[PDB]
Amino acid sequence: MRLLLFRQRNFRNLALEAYRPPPGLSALVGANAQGKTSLLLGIHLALGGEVPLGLADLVRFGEEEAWLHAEVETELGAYRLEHRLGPGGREVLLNGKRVSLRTLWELPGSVLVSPLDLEAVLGPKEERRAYLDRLIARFSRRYAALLSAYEKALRQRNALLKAGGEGLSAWDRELARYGDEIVALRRRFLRRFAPILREVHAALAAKEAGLRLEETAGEGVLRALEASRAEERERGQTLVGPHRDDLVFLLEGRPAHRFASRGEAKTLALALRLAEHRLLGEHHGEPPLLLVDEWGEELDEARRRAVLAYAQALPQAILAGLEAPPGVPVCSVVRGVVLCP
Amino acid sequence: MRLLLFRQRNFRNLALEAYRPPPGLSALVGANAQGKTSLLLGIHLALGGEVPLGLADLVRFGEEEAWLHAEVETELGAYRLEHRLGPGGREVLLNGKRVSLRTLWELPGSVLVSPLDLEAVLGPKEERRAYLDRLIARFSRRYAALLSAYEKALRQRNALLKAGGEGLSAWDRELARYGDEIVALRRRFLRRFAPILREVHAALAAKEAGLRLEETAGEGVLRALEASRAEERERGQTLVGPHRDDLVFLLEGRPAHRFASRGEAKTLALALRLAEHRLLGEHHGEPPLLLVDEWGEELDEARRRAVLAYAQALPQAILAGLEAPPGVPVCSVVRGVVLCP
DNA sequence: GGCCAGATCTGCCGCGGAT
DNA sequence: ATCCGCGGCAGATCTGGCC
Ligand SMILES: Nc1ncnc2c1ncn2[C@@H]1O[C@H](COP(=O)(O)OP(=O)(O)NP(=O)(O)O)[C@@H](O)[C@H]1O
Ligand SMILES: Nc1ncnc2c1ncn2[C@@H]1O[C@H](COP(=O)(O)OP(=O)(O)NP(=O)(O)O)[C@@H](O)[C@H]1O
Ligand SMILES: [Mg+2]
Ligand SMILES: [Mg+2]
């Protein structure tokens, strides 16, 4: 796509009226507590994204109605997106008519690279496994249905199994029915995902990076549930299934959650986001818009040049931070208002 | 006190043999993956602290012998500490004779400021309570004993309650004593930790900081237990007690886990660590050594000027980062070795 | 060698936002 | 009105430290 115009009314501490991004790479500079995060967050929400914060904290102090408006231009045709926050919830108007948030799933959208994306690379097992589930669900709508259906059957089987025992064969059949499909989809996705991550991180650094998926029921879910009946009966839980897998990111053959430093995990997080951005371009046909917050804070001079040189080949990108990249147009944010010369 | 010497043998990527820090304020400059965090972590461990990492990941790749040696000088007299990490575990020598690790708890020690101290401010409900508990436990052992006793008594009471009902009145009285002592000690500590925090944060920024503790059994544990009898019986869990408190950090009157930016959160975390350092120095008699990692990574010029101006008045402190503070001695780390001008 | 502290992990229940 | 995805809380297994 190509963003044309952004307009807001009483969104967080913002005090602007209109913002027109230029084509190609851009920049934003400022001091602490000025509103770079607020502006990027508003641009992300205007195109149909998600935010960690609740909708009651996204309105100005003492008001009840926020309004965001953005205009985009694609080959298909021009669009106008209207958002209206408040107490009842969101209200989206695509081109002038009320419509649900789900219909925007087909549009390219945007990609937001933020500091909290770094806590999945070096986080606990649950968080690492949860990161992959919501990434595959962005490309296939069938994966989410299977993932939601498997959980109900697992819970019912475990609840029955806590009560001594019964003819629980049917729940075993259902669990085996869903787990095999889930595992096959995961393998199929990672087979495509690994080479792009390998060849993207090789342009920002030197060492190689990879993935390893440790499976528990790889040969068969039912043939693994039959092989652990005594221990499962004694313990009272289902100990085998896709809900117990492991994902680890490797740096030169070592786990990244125990050996990697901070400026070395930041590059892995950015490479993961950039590899996701590339695949969505082939899936949709038009690459999304890239938004990066604090692009070069925790990195040294060698890495910053590589990031800045990679980011300049994209159709459109916006970087924000305390310092101005050299050679690119620069805006400024002062107490919520954006002004450019 | 003072730190006079530091020597190692096969501790992570470090390859130095001796390192002598000058009195006053020092610095360390390096690129990514050079050994700044490793050096600070080694000093912190050698002086008698605790490290988040595991003891099997702290040894050089391919060996099972780690050695840490440090020489200090207290007002009473000089000391000498040595460490040895291997398969059996940690081993500590004090002037040539073995001693348990609990003995070093009386010595002043050190204070470490790290990026994962920022998760307490912006973290969930339980993490802030855990931070408060482990902060209070560094000034008294009665708190630890009461915590353990109360936890065990509550676990037994819940186990009994989940299976029908019995003479619970014998179990309400034992829990009430520990709960009352715990809440009294918490109030006593927070009545003194707040003015110091406000005064310290008033020198690094402009806004105001505060603390708020919300209690479910302020009037009395027995009264609340009697009041919530029907709910406890129906749900099956004790819904009232010191294990259900809130700690909220306020910036100009609003909670910091929602209405706050990155720089303000960093300043809050640093102010909390400095307040703990000052209180601990008052408690023992000699302020502990201060170690700061990436002091000024995500701050503007004014905030890090203020931080440097404050740190210039300490008996001994060491700062590390990608850049140097103007006007202080510096040392450079390359490939794991340290060379001073 | 043995057993108590104590932080880490996994499944269950109730709550908040969309269709 | 109802399913969906989620934050908060309690419980059990593990490894390492002290007697
Ligand atoms: N809903 C809101 N209404 C009004 N002010 C708000 C709101 N949310 C946040 N703020 C204020 O906005 C400021 C921080 O905004 P923010 O967008 O994070 O700045 P920033 O560009 O991110 N600075 P930085 O710390 O470098 O990231 C603070 O003064 C907050 O109190
Ligand atoms: N057990 C180990 N044995 C040998 N090398 C190790 C070990 N653990 C980590 N390393 C190396 O140490 C590097 C990072 O060291 P580190 O001390 O974090 O540097 P740093 O000063 O923190 N650089 P920065 O990324 O800015 O924090 C890793 O990239 C590894 O190459
Ligand atoms: Mg921000
Ligand atoms: Mg580091």
Residue-range domain boundaries for chain B: 1-115+289-341, 116-288
No. of helices (H) and no. of strands (E), chain B: 8, 14
**Nearest C-alpha neighbor of B49 from the set B126, B118, B101, B6:** B101
Resolution (A): 3.1
**Of B89, B88, B76, nearest to B284 (Cα)?**
B76
A115 lines ligand 2 (CB under 6 A): no
**Residue linked to tokens 């605790």:** B50
Identify, with chain letter, the residue nearest to nucleotide D6 (CA–C1').
A52
Nucleotide nearest to A148 (CA to C1'): D4
Query: To which residue do tokens 């490479």 refer?
Result: A271
Question: Alpha-carbon distance A330 to A295, whole Å?
Answer: 14
The DSSP bridge partners found for residue A254 are A251
Whole-angstrom Cα distance, residue B150 to residue B156?
A: 10
Does the C-beta of A218 come within 7 A of strand C? no
List Cβ neighbours of A284 (8 Å cut-off, separation of 6 or more): A106, A108
Number of residues that this document lists for chain A: 341
- Which residue, chain included where needed, has tokens 């009966």? A233
Nucleotides of C under 7 A from a protein CB: 5-12, 14, 16-19
With the CA atoms of B145, B112, A303 and A311 taken in that order, what torsion angle do they form, in degrees rounded to the nearest 10?
A: 60
Q: Is A57 on the interface with B (CB under 8 A)?
A: yes
H-only helix segments in A205-300: 221-225, 229-235, 262-284
Q: Do the strands B289-293 and B110-113 form a parallel or antiparallel pair, or are they unpaired?
A: parallel
Residues near B116 by Cβ (< 8 Å), separated by ≥ 6? B52
Tokens representing B294 are 């990436």
- To 5 degrees, how large is the angle CA A4–CA A134–CA A199? 75
Other Cβ atoms closer than 10 A to A76: 9
For A88, phi and psi rounded to 5 degrees?
-75, -25
Estimate the crossing angle of helix A262-284 against helix A169-204, to 10 degrees.
110
- The DSSP bridge pattern shows strands B246-251 and B254-255 to be antiparallel
C-beta of residue B71 within 8 angstroms of C-beta of residue B78: yes
Measured at the CA of B60, the angle between CA B56 and CA B65, to 5 degrees, comes to 75
Cβ distance B317 to B273 under 8 Å? no
Three-state SS letters, chain A: CCEEEEEEECECCCCCCCECCCCEEEEEECCCCCCHHHHHHHHHHHCCCCCCCCCCCCECCCCCCEEEEEEEECCCCEEEEEEEECCCCCCEEECCEECCCHHHHHCCCEEEECHHHHHCCCCCHHHHHHHHHHHHCCCCHHHHHHHHHHHHHHHHHHHHHHCCCCCCHHHHHHHHHHHHHHHHHHHHHHHHHHHHHHHHHHHHCCCCEEEEEECCCCCCHHHHHHHHHHHHHHHCCCCCCHHHCEEEEEECCEECCCCCCHHHHHHHHHHHHHHHHHHHHHHHCCCCEEEEECCCCCCCHHHHHHHHHHHCCCCEEEEEECCCCCCCCCEEEECCEEECC
DSSP class of residue B246 equals E
Strand-pair partners of B334: B337
- Alpha carbon distance A315, A288 (integer Å): 9
> Distances in Å between the alpha carbon of A294 and those of A71, A125, B46, B155, B263?
25, 27, 35, 46, 12
Interatomic CA distance for residues B183 and B181, integer angstroms: 6
Identify the residue whose tokens are 């499976």. A215
φ, ψ dihedrals at A317, nearest 5°: -155, 150
CB-based contact, B264 to chain A, within 8 Å:
yes
The SS3 call for residue B148 is helix
Beta-carbon contacts of residue A253 (< 8 Å; ≥ 6 apart):
none
A10 conformational bin, left if phi > 0, alpha if psi -120 to 50, beta if neither: left
Rounded distance between C-alpha atoms, residue B88 and residue B71, angstroms: 25
Query: Is A38's Cβ below 8 Å from some Cβ in B?
Result: no
Q: Could you check: is the Cβ of residue B55 within 7 Å of any atom of nucleic acid strand D? A: yes
Distance between CA atoms of residues A25 and A5, nearest Å: 16
